[PDB]
């Protein structure tokens, strides 16, 4: 592709041709009009899954959730037009997005009635029915997690692009635990690198060894980051990756930092998270050998908003690792309060 760019650090511009990777996580707009395989084909797949004892779908990312939310009405109308007693209801998503052991089956034959495009066909709404097909919401009691499909869509050939506004998807035919490769872009240029997709933006740098610099996540997936899209993927221990492998963290030396282990018990329940290495406001961290061991991550403010000031770690390296969520500043698993009982604090109750 041809383009031009500017570098405010060096105050210089240039043009040419090459490969460019764009940050579409920060300032997340919705510039894509998705649409699945086909109205009749999707309806047939949903119906067959319903008769195969699958009560719902657990979305793999926010993209799939938005897709379902947009095509819900059309799908319901198509289902009703064939006289099928089944309604699809789409709820909200909450992190982390756990796996489901089921997959949507590819239908041999599409439904006979309906139209052949995802365009508004005068939108005559359908009627509510007893049977329901729940897309991820607060409906775990109704449809247990062990009966839900997960990671069953796959972006098509020229379905994603720089100059595009429609993304095409379809139902896959195989079983896999890997994140969709069609939306992943990683690049290293000199002394800066980045692994990214539609939801993750992970930045790395070279100070004296390569290390994590900052991360920005607007979702918590649980697929596996494919090795074909990772830099320096050999001779790495899974106990050193900062972002856990089970949370779609890349298995690379760029996903590490000296003095820290995998953060299995971070505040992964937040809606949007930003990982950065900087002390939380109004706090100070020391390094001493007389501090507690690793444990669940703690928030820097009490439930009443009081701020705890003195913290410590055993072997961690300054500046400390911290998570910046909407409700406050959390610290890494290695950093514990000094001279303060931990029963008074708020901790993360989730694990990866």
């Amino acid at each position: 592709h041809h383009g031009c760019s500017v570098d405010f650090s060096k105050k210089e511009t240039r043009c040419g041709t090459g490969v460019f990777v764009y940050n579409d996580v920060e300032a997340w707009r919705d510039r894509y009009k998705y649409h699945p395989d086909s109205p009749r084909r999707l309806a047939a797949a949903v119906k067959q899954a319903w008769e195969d004892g699958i009560c719902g779908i657990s979305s793999v990312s926010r993209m799939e959730n938005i897709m379902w939310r947009s095509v819900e009405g059309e799908l319901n109308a198509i289902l009703e037009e064939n006289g099928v007693q089944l309604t699809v209801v789409v709820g909200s998503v909450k992190n982390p997005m756990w796996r489901g052991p089921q997959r949507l089956p590819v239908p041999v034959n599409e439904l006979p009635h309906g139209w052949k495009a995802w365009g508004k066909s005068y939108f005559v709404r359908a009627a509510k029915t007893n049977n329901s097909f729940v897309v991820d919401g607060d409906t775990l009691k109704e449809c247990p997690l062990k009966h839900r499909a997960w990671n069953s869509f796959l972006v098509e050939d020229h379905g994603f692009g720089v100059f595009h506004t429609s993304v095409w998807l379809k139902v896959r035919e195989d079983y896999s635990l890997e994140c969709d490769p069609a939306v992943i872009g990683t690049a290293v240029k000199g002394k800066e690198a980045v692994h990214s997709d539609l939801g993750y933006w992970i930045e790395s740098e070279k100070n004296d060894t390569w290390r994590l610099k900052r991360a920005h996540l607007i979702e918590m997936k649980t697929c596996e980051w494919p090795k074909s899209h990772t830099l320096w993927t050999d001779g790495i221990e899974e106990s050193d990756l900062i972002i856990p492998k089970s949370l779609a963290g890349p298995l690379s030396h760029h996903n590490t930092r000296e003095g820290y282990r995998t953060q299995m018990k971070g505040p992964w329940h937040s809606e949007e998270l930003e990982i950065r290495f900087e002390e939380c406001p109004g706090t100070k961290v020391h390094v001493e050998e007389t501090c507690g061991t690793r444990g669940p991550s703690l928030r820097s403010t009490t439930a009443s908003g009081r701020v705890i000031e003195e913290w410590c770690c055993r072997e961690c390296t300054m500046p400390p690792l911290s998570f910046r969520a909407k409700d406050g500043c959390w610290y890494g698993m290695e950093i514990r309060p000094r001279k303060e009982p931990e029963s008074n604090l708020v901790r993360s109750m989730v694990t990866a």
């Epitope: 007389t290 439930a303 009443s304 009081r306 001279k339 303060e340 009982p341 931990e342 029963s343 008074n344």
Partner: antibody
Framework: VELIESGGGVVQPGRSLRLSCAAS????????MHWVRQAPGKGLEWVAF????????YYADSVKGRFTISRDNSKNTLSLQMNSLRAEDTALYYC???????????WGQGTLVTVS | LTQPPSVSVSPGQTARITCSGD??????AYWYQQKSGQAPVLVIY???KRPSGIPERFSGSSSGTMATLTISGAQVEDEADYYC???????????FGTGTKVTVL
């Protein structure tokens, strides 16, 4: 900013009793509460602790297993269920809000409990 | 946590109250004052800090395993029983001191 507790009285050994403490003047759901007793003319003694959301409870070893603490953030009330009472449990029971740093610590007035 | 059984001070002098126990190096300690017939009143929190409304004559510090409370210019409005409040090694069980009685002459 005031704590009122009640439910005291004279009971026979081996029976059961329940105490309650009503709170008002602050966001009850943001703070952790303690139970503290004091024998007549003796020193203070810690009894039990419950976190702000009620997920974590801890009891002193002397009353471990016999007692049970709970709270209701909807009704601004915490309670202490006591079973298998004994003679050494005769004391004046407080309902405190302690370890709050610069936010101030408040105490109840106490409810005398006697075991005969 | 242990405290002296009792302390007697001449008026105009200063008294030292010591609360000695393990886990103090890793834990804070609050100090409470209880006059006869009343509920206890917080005096020193986090080993050095005075809440608003408390005379400036109250001060305290910790060193290793010894937490000390000092009443500067001990006078009659201090006849009370002082207790140290802290927690054991894992901040899940709290414990009070054995308490000390302060007498002015």
């Amino acid at each position: 900013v005031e704590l009122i507790e009640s439910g005291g009285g004279v009971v026979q050994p081996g029976r059961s009793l329940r105490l309650s403490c009503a709170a008002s003047g602050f966001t009850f759901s943001n703070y952790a509460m303690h139970w503290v007793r004091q024998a007549p003319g003796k020193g203070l003694e810690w009894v039990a602790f419950i976190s702000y959301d009620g997920s974590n409870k801890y009891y002193a070893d002397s009353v471990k297993g016999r007692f049970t603490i709970s709270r209701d953030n909807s009704k601004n009330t915490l309670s202490l269920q006591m079973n298998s009472l004994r003679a050494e449990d005769t004391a004046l029971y407080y309902c405190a809000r302690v370890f709050n740093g610069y936010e101030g610590d408040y105490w109840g007035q106490g409810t005398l409990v006697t075991v005969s | 946590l242990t405290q002296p059984p009792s302390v007697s001070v001449s008026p105009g002098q200063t008294a030292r109250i010591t609360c000695s126990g393990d886990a103090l190096p890793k834990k804070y300690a609050y100090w409470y004052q209880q006059k006869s017939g009343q509920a206890p009143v917080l005096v020193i929190y986090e080993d050095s800090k005075r809440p608003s409304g408390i005379p400036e004559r109250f001060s305290g510090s910790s060193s290793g395993t010894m937490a000390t409370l000092t009443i500067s210019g001990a006078q009659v409005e201090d006849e009370a029983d002082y207790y140290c409040y802290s927690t054991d090694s894992s901040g899940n069980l709290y414990v009070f001191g054995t308490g000390t009685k302060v007498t002015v002459l």
